Write a protein that binds this ligand. Structure first.
Ligand SMILES: [Mg+2]
Ligand SMILES: [Mg+2]
Ligand SMILES: [Mg+2]
Ligand SMILES: [Mg+2]
Ligand SMILES: [Mg+2]
Ligand SMILES: [Mg+2]
Ligand SMILES: [Mg+2]
Ligand SMILES: [Mg+2]
Ligand SMILES: [Mg+2]
Ligand SMILES: [Mg+2]
Ligand SMILES: [Mg+2]
Ligand SMILES: [Mg+2]
Lengths: 141, 146, 55, 124, 185
RNA sequence: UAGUCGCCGUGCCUACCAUGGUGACCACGGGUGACGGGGAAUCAGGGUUCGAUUCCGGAGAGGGAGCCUGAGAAACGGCUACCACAUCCAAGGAAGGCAGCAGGCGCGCAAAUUACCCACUCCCGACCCGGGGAGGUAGUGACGAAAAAUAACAAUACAGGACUCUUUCGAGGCCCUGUAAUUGGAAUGAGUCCACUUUAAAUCCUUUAACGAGGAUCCAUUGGAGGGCAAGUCUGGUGCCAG
């Protein structure tokens, strides 16, 4: 503070109330455009259909072909590049199957090589992708 | 695609030009009509129709899962199938999607409920899959057996 | 390209896992660990080598 | 090898009876049954064992002490006149009816449905 | 609307730094000494201590001759002297800051039993206690954590209903006696 | 100012006069993913966010409106309309509202058995006698809290360490600590399971006979091992490929 007056409570509080908005994160929390724009709409997971398999190329120093997958959500209809992680797990993901998608730990921010891919697959057809990779369970056919 | 319903159990299967495929099948323990007499029998048909509709909800959910793709069908045709008016509840149900009602290709009755009935419902389809060589074969070999 | 999916994990040699003596558990296991820290060894000169330090 | 002291004993002037928590000592064995307990209190209290109704014993953990509440009524006629239905069916001399509560309710509404003489025909 | 309590809380708090090498050392030293099952078991003690130090500061911070401070301090003192940590001559809440966890861990029953010598090891002592082998003033004790007051410390001995006590042998001697007897004939 | 209504005071309403009232001390208007409070989470001290939710107060039973009956209702498990939606007809007609309990459809990432009882607590009624999906009791339930098993001991070897001894290496063992698929018997539930108790009738738990453990095979997991960050330069495969 600078006005250390005994009766400037109002003037102070007002000033604070104006400047909280210049903080980028508060504005992020309280204006709705971010929450609405986010397809997750303040959610951890979201279900969606696989419609095509895509090999997105990595950024520099690194060099790799990341295996992503174009899902279309049911509730909104928005389109997402959900990335499948680990080794040999893509042969499992068949086309036209429901997968539960989650975030990527960054709250609206791209991560490393995969440019603009904030989402990863957890399940396939009520079957944990982990269980398929480990070999505990099998795909129902 | 093909959905096959029965009080016994369901079955889902696809159909290429020549090849016939099977996607999924399942069971549900829907308890039967006798259930419990005297006390329940009068209010049995009402509770049972609710439970049958719940089975219908599960079948409906499978058709959305399969035949819908972002509220838009990816597979071209969808042949619903069942006996005792199972398919009609699936057709007219509100869970069944409207963009899909636009493209309801056909509903088909069967007996016993299953793969042979799935095949028969294809035979009722026949005229619907006129472009397919499988249908032209079905018709030609039908005359050859005649 | 999408040709190379699942190459290496597969081509590696699927070796069967060998059997081992079951490890002690619980309170007793923690006791043993304490003992391997303090009560067994005696003071030694220099820098201490790690538990799994092999060479 | 049983021993029995009394606890919180009291003289009720309004039912003219005595009531007390029976502190038992019973090392090395299960909760002793009520039939024997009643005969033995009967001989304890110089009263017939017909009237002594005792209940709610609970053996403590460790196993050398149960605790159950007890009271002794002046007559059989007065006790039967003014005693719980569940506490007689404990023994069997009384026996509650075994018609389920929902079936009584369904009876009530089924009788509630029809007017007139058919009421008699309502019961089966 | 229901007839229930729903009053419960966590009894402990985890440490703020997870991989202090000195901390790991300390928890292991104390484990080795007293035969505990895990680290939570200690930390819940750390929580009780946290409560004690925080209240102790509150009374020291109050003005002297506060009737609240005197009564509350003397009650805390009653509990500590009863357990028999501080001496009744020694009772004054400044010494609580010069005070350590080991004195409270000393009055656990597994330790007090090994110190008494009636158990070979501290771990054996634990196995006995959990095996319901011993009693205290006609009360069977299943729980090793039981804080023993000084009054009830002296009266520990074997139980009468026990294979070790004057009673029937346990399940294994039942098997070894029945099996060995059958081996005889 | 004078009346109307109303149980009274008042633009509550009617008529006649006067022309006032609020505003940078943020009115007015718009928003609120806002029923309120008692409280919860977090914390050095200051503070920050949350609080539909078992206690209190408010409002509401498809949408709005209107009313009889009553001490008390603008009642919704009472009526009458219009609107929205639904059910049968012999064609004239009939009947409707789970934001009560169970259960169900639908939405979804997302949520339980159409169970038993007035025996406890209280309530209603003309009541010593009736009723109570309020309530209680069981079933499911890894939202979470408390305690606590999955081995302990001895004797033999060995490696070591305080002792005597020994030039070291070794020797003597009152002392030990650890280890050794080397033996030795001692001890337990979990469970199985007679019998009571429990309790409305049961169940669970506590007590108790009889089986129930030597690798006490009655097989404890999840994540990690360059740094951040406790912890393999061990071995084999791949070679900017896969990850
Ligand atoms: Mg308050
Ligand atoms: Mg309230
Ligand atoms: Mg209020
Ligand atoms: Mg309302
Ligand atoms: Mg109404
Ligand atoms: Mg109703
Ligand atoms: Mg009502
Ligand atoms: Mg509703
Ligand atoms: Mg009652
Ligand atoms: Mg209820
Ligand atoms: Mg790090
Ligand atoms: Mg390290």
């Amino acid at each position: 503070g600078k006005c250390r007056g005994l009766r400037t409570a109002r003037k102070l509080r007002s000033h604070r109330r104006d400047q909280k908005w210049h903080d980028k994160q508060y504005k992020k929390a309280h204006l709705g455009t971010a929450l609405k724009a986010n397809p997750f709409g303040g959610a951890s997971h979201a279900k969606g259909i696989v419609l095509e398999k895509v090999g997105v190329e990595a950024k520099q120093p690194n060099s790799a072909i990341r295996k992503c997958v174009r899902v279309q959500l049911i509730k909104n209809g928005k389109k997402i590049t959900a990335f499948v992680p680990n080794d040999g797990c893509l042969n499992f993901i068949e086309e036209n199957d429901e997968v539960l998608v989650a975030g990527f730990g960054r709250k609206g921010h791209a991560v490393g090589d995969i440019p603009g891919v904030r989402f990863k697959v957890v399940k396939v057809a009520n079957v944990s992708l982990l269980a398929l990779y480990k070999g505990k369970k099998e795909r129902p056919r | 695609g093909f959905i096959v319903i029965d009080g016994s159990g369901a079955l889902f299967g696809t159909l290429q030009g020549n090849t016939r495929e099977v996607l999924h099948k399942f069971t549900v323990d829907l308890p039967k009509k006798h259930g419990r007499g005297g006390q329940s029998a009068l209010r049995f048909a009402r509770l049972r129709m609710e439970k049958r509709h719940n089975y219908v909800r599960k079948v409906a959910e499978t058709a959305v899962q399969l035949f819908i793709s972002g509220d838009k069908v990816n597979v071209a045709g969808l042949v619903l199938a069942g006996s005792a008016d199972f398919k009609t509840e699936l057709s007219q149900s509100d869970m069944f999607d409207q963009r899909l009602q636009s493209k309801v290709l056909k509903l088909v009755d069967i007996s016993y409920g299953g793969e042979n009935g799935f095949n028969q419902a294809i035979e009722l389809s026949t005229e619907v899959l006129s472009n397919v060589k499988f249908i032209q074969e079905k018709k030609l070999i039908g005359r050859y057996f005649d | 390209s999408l040709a190379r999916v699942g190459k290496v994990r597969g081509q590696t040699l699927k070796v069967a896992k060998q059997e081992k003596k079951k490890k002690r558990t619980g309170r007793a296991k923690r006791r043993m660990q304490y003992n391997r820290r303090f009560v067994n060894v005696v003071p030694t000169f220099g820098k201490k080598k790690g538990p799994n330090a092999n060479s | 090898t049983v021993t029995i002291r009394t606890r919180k004993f009291m003289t009720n002037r309004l039912l003219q009876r005595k009531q007390m928590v029976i502190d038992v000592l019973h090392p090395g064995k299960a909760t002793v049954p009520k039939t024997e307990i009643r005969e033995k209190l009967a001989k304890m209290y110089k009263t017939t064992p017909d009237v002594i109704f005792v209940f709610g014993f609970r053996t403590h953990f460790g196993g050398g002490k149960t605790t159950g509440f007890g009271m002794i009524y002046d007559s059989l006629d007065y006790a039967k006149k003014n005693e719980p239905k569940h506490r007689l069916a404990r023994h069997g001399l009384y026996e509650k009816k075994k018609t389920s509560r929902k079936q009584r309710k369904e009876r009530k509404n089924r009788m509630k449905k029809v007017r007139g003489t058919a009421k008699a025909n309502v019961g089966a | 609307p229901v007839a229930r309590s729903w009053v419960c809380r966590k009894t402990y708090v985890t440490p703020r730094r997870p991989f202090e090498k000195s901390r790991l050392d300390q928890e292991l030293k104390l484990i080795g000494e007293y035969g505990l099952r895990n680290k939570r078991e200690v930390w819940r003690v750390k929580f009780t201590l946290a409560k004690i130090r925080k209240a102790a500061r509150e009374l020291l911070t109050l003005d002297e001759k506060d009737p609240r401070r005197l009564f509350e301090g003397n009650a805390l003192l009653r509990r500590l002297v009863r357990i028999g940590v501080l001496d009744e001559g020694k009772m004054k809440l400044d010494y609580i800051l010069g005070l350590k966890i080991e004195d409270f861990l000393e009055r656990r029953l597994q330790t007090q039993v090994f110190k008494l010598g009636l158990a070979k090891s501290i771990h054996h002592a634990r196995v006995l206690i959990r095996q319901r082998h011993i009693r205290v003033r006609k009360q069977v004790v299943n729980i090793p954590s039981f804080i023993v007051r000084l009054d009830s410390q002296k009266h520990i001995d074997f139980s009468l209903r026990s294979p070790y006590g004057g009673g029937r042998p346990g399940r294994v001697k039942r098997k070894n006696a029945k099996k060995g007897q059958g081996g005889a004939g």
